[PDB]
Design a protein around this ligand. Sequence first.
Ligand SMILES: [Zn+2]
Ligand SMILES: [Zn+2]
Lengths: 90, 215, 423
Amino acid sequence: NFLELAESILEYFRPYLGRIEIMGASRRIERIYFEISETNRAQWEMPQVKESKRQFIFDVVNEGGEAEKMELFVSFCEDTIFEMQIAAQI
Amino acid sequence: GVKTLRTILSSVTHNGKQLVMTVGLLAVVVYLYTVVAFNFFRKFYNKSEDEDEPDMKCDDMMTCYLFHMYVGVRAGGGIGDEIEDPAGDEYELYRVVFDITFFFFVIVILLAIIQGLIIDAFGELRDQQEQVKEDMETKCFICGIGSDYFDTTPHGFETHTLEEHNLANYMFFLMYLINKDETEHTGQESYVWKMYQERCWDFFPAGDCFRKQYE
Amino acid sequence: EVQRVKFLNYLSRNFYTLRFLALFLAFAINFILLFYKVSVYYFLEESTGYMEPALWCLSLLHTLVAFLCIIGYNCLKVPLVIFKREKELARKLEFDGLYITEQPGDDDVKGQWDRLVLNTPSFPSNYWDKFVKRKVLDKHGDIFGRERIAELLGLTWLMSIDVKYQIWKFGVIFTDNSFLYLGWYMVMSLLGHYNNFFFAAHLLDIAMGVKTLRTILSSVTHNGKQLVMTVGLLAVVVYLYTVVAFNFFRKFYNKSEDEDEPDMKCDDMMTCYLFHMYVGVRAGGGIGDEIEDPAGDEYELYRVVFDITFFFFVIVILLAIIQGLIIDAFGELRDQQEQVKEDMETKCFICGIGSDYFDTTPHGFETHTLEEHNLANYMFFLMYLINKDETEHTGQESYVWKMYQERCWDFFPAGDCFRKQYE
Ligand SMILES: [Zn+2]
Ligand SMILES: [Zn+2]
């Protein structure tokens, strides 16, 4: 009720929003939030990313049920970040 | 260009180590027949200009092999299409069966496996393609569990994915970590940052979910 | 002579690679066998003069290995399979007593040779509990005569040996698939002394090289009972058509040198069936490819529909059935091939349950296997049992040892697991 009262201007902010579950080091699953840079978000949208994600998901679901889901995921992220490190150059 | 054709090359040889046998199994067949053919049946191999003039039947072991390796390996209409017969003569009962051993064993038993070695194989990685889309839309790519439990709220598992787990958020999270100085790290992120330092990556859900865990 | 004994032990010591390189020998023989030509008899060597003469030895060389390998098999699986049969029959008497009771005739076939073997002293040649016979009198003997069951049962080197066991043993040697295999192989090898071209068939050995080809043969043969219907149906159909063909349609079967000269159409019932059996059973392009038509005449619509029936019921149905009959099977047993790794990596090979529950800890179910259940550990535990004296057996291993004695093997998990059972 108070939220809905305060819900008046939050919509602007959802783009900016980043939210995820985490199973933290205390045996609970926090629902933390975090901000996402927009300039970064823009770079994400078009190149070998969304397609790379189509690829990556294929790179995983091809062997995804193994608990490297967590782990294979790692590099893709670090890689696309590097991709944005490259995307920034142009 | 694009995946649709890349599938095809992938078909050829994701499971091509099976294929090793096939041309070898066929060589077997052909080394087999031909030598007996070079023994008991040379006299049927003519491809002379019909009338009795000297010709290139058999003539060499290599050649009679390559002949079947050209013709018989294609066959289609089989060697019996171009062997010189009836014949009509000695060991005819055998040559026919020799033609038949050439036929059930080859025309069918050889070639088909050779086909099906690929065809399922085409249907393998292709089946995975929807299976990708299926597993994204069934089991959660992130927490696992399955869509099923989050479909309990209407249209809800996309909220469990695109709005909750999103998957893609994680990546932005890292750069969110990296851009920040360690001073300003929240203590929740920070072990998680440390967990990045340590790379167990165990803080991704076992598959228990927040609202699943409670309510 | 002990150098020869240990040399054979080297022979077994390298049993596989000899087999493999030998097959490469024969393969090479066969590649290079691509050269002889009669002038009558003569051999066309190309360049080097020594290829055929090397073969004067290579045949025998290959043959040597054959001879070699066979003897090695005698040192290899043979005492193993004998041990296997030994355990078999022995445990059978241990619990069933079939010769005391459920005896074979030529029915229950295996046992017909096996009847005689029990009589021999040396029946328990290598079972390492080689006293079982007295347990057998201990159990089944009370139902009957205690000594009536005993009536059933209980160089120098030349005279020793012990007799009746031996013929059964060589018969067990006959039972083996592998030994027929190497024997057919070697007999062919000696055929190479008679003729090097009949000597080529050794390449067939590739069928066991390796699993993939064995996959293939297995694709064929696991269900030939299905083949029966097809070849039968084919024969059926072929009669079916051919007879009417000998009736209503003889006049279309010519394969005369085009012009009106007498020819080998039909002519006999057999001959026509084998005409279709050479052709129509192949066809591809159909019987209509070499039947003499149009025609263009009487009963044309019926021969044409005849051709159509031939083209559906045969060309399409039969062949393909056979083809699927094979392919579905290749995918079957192949799917069983992946299914091994799948089940090993899903349901626990031991406790069952499924990986799923142990995947709850990360990378966990491999730990539920190799680091918990493993599997080889059971057996290492068994040797561990066997080596220990009964005094020093821990009570757990001791009842378990008894369970070995009794062979229910129930103490292998229902599928409950320790940490699964608790926490
Ligand atoms: Zn998830
Ligand atoms: Zn287990």
